[PDB]
């Protein structure tokens, strides 16, 4: 099985902190297939569903056995601290051990990344947001290109995903 259109975009280097505060850069991502989306801890109201069907993912993941990582970044990083990012993945039965969640970053720093690597818009929330927009799930191969993006907020095609992640590792 190869891989369809791949989107190719070309992440950028980066390093930021995970919610134990240990760094976590693209290299360190290096031979590693992952995912990535773009969240927020901080939601009385309504909070969108990403991190649940990221949740979901993780877990059919592990259920066929499939070497992959799981990166989440923040996209208000200013509130997002990472004992924020730890009291935010408690509210789900998610585990730590191929998911990071990031921060240590300005909200200018992570937009631009966010532009340039995943070619998405992300802005800090108004307090509040449904989901504004889309929201999208990337898949990223072992060699840091952008190979695919999927609906996170919606019909999240969960099969289809993880068929790309193991085709994605193909030849290493
Ligand atoms: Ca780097
Ligand atoms: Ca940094
Ligand atoms: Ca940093
Ligand atoms: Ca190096
Ligand atoms: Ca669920
Ligand atoms: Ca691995
Ligand atoms: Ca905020
Ligand atoms: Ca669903």
């Known amino acids: 099985q190869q891989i369809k259109d791949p989107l190719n975009y070309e992440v950028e280097p980066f390093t930021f902190q995970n919610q134990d505060g240990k ?21 009385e109201t309504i909070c969108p569903p990403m991190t649940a069907h990221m ?17 989440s970044f ?3 990083p200013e509130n997002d601290k990472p004992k924020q990012l730890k009291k935010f993945a408690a509210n789900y039965p ?20 966010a532009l340039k690597s995943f070619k998405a818009i992300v802005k800090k929330p108004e307090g509040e947001d449904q989901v504004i927009h889309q929201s999208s799930f990337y898949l990223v191969g072992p060699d840091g290109k ?25 030849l290493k």
């Open 55 to 71: 949740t979901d993912l993780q877990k059919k993941l592990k259920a066929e056995n499939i070497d992959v990582r799981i990166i």
């Open 146 to 170: 952008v190979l695919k993006d999927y609906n996170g907020v919606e019909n999240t095609p969960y099969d289809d995903i993880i068929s790309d992640v193991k085709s994605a590792s193909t």
């Open 94 to 113: 998610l585990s730590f051990d191929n998911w990071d969640f990031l921060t240590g970053y300005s909200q200018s720093e992570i937009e631009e990344f």
């Open 23 to 43: 760094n976590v850069s693209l290299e360190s991502l290096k031979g590693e297939v992952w995912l990535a989306d773009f969240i927020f801890t901080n939601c």
């Open 74 to 76: 923040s996209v208000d």
